[PDB]
Amino acid sequence: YRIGSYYITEEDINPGDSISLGFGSWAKVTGVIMGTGVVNPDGSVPNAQRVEFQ
């Protein structure tokens, strides 16, 4: 995941000009937790894997 404010493709001459540039949705979350679990801290069941849509 790469974040940039310039609307230039990663393979373009203006960009680094290497690799394939793909649109990324949302922010990257470190593998271990998924966020909302328990009102009082108990923790829910998180999700893992890369590319997996769940």
Place this chain on the structure above:
Amino acid sequence: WYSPGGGYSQRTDNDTHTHTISGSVSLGRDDISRQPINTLPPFRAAHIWRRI
């Protein structure tokens, strides 16, 4: 009263009522008792709120 006809006298002290009499009553119930608030089955229930 048995509606008995007197031999010589007349029972003028007995009569049949026609309508009821409305009177003022005293106080009654004060208020309701305790009631439950919130759901016990939902207490400590895990809720998922993680964003995408």
